[PDB]
Design a protein around this ligand. Structure first.
Ligand SMILES: CC(C)(O)C(=O)Nc1ccc([N+](=O)[O-])c(C(F)(F)F)c1
Lengths: 9, 242
């Protein structure tokens, strides 16, 4: 997900 | 004051929408700007939440879930405070470049929600909410909406919510009367966030018909997470009934 990609940065 | 020191230190700064104010207002441009501002505010909410006392104790999937479910209420409550602090609630201060007078409230097709947000803003004044109460109440809003089927580690969420409630009791400490006032105000956020979720959802479904742009993360969250709230699978935690 785009959110999870952002979060896991 | 270690806890409050941290909340002050992590509080986001100013976030702009990028709206073109040097053009007559239109529904499509106002809403495309609100959507862009919502994406930029979500990035700041992530950085803020990750830095909260105890938040990293939650399961990572629960950290992500609670941010996505609570984002709209967090944004409503912070915008109501900016509106009170910057313009004495005379307009809705979404951003320094996105300030809604009543005409814009009407033009946005979100008029009822906006009036309810202006009322919330006024309450900050009426109830003499302190900046420290504001910061503790906003943090508690992160921990105020969850799935009926349970979080991955629900017990760790319950403990962290309880600790935030304890910090609010310590800030208040006549204590009961104030607790009643603040929890009524917190509960009032939830129906406004409910109505904004409904509007956002409906707008996404018709967005091609009305020329409104949604950024990728906004379109994902409104299509994947928001409908869990609208369909009653994810529910607020109310203090009063409700
Ligand atoms: C329409 C939708 C999804 O863009 C939206 O509700 N955007 C939005 C953006 C920013 C903010 N804000 O707090 O500054 C808010 C709101 F929380 F006030 F309502 C909504």
């Amino acid at each position: 997900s785009a959110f999870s990609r952002l979060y896991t940065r | 004051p270690i806890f409050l020191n941290v909340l002050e230190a992590i509080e986001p700064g100013v976030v702009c929408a990028g709206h073109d104010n040097n053009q007559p207002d239109s529904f499509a441009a106002l809403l495309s700007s609100l959507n862009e501002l919502g994406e930029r505010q979500l990035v700041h909410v992530v950085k803020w939440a990750k830095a909260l006392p105890g938040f990293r104790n939650l399961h990572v999937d629960d950290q992500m879930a609670v941010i996505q479910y609570s984002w709209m209420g967090l944004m409503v409550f912070a915008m109501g405070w900016r509106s009170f602090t910057n313009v004495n609630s005379a307009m809705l201060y979404f951003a320094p470049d996105l300030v809604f007078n009543e005409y814009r409230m009407h033009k946005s097709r979100m008029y009822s929600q906006c009036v309810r947000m202006r009322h919330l803003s006024q309450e900050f004044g009426w109830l003499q909410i302190t900046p420290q109460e504001f910061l503790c109440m906003k943090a508690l809003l992160l921990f105020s909406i969850i799935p009926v089927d349970g979080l991955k580690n629900q017990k760790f969420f319950d403990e962290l919510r309880m600790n935030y409630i304890k910090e609010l009791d310590r800030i208040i400490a006549s204590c009961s009367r104030r607790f009643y006032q603040l929890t009524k105000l917190l509960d009032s956020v939830q129906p406004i966030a409910r109505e904004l979720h409904q509007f956002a959802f409906d707008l996404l479904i018709k967005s091609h018909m009305v020329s409104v742009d949604f950024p990728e993360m906004m379109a994902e969250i409104i299509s994947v997470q928001v409908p869990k709230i609208l369909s009653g699978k994810v529910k607020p935690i109310y203090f009063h009934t409700q």
